[PDB]
Symmetry: none
Subunit: 43 residues, 2 copies
Amino acid sequence: GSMSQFTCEEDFYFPWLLIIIFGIFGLTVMLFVFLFSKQQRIK
Amino acid sequence: GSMSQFTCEEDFYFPWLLIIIFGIFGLTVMLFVFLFSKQQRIK
């Protein structure tokens, strides 16, 4: 019987999906807020 | 008659990834703007 196996070398770390979302959410928000701070001025 | 069907097994390109990011980016932005429209009323 043939069995499938993952690449240990890769050393996958889960949850992976949570990282993908958390990563984009952080950059998106951090960028949105930061970019907005520069867009807002007194003059 | 009939035509042969082929496909990429190795799947070099990373289209799935583009979907994950595009998906979050859309919801994040769409939500940010929408939420802002209701969070900020106009005179």
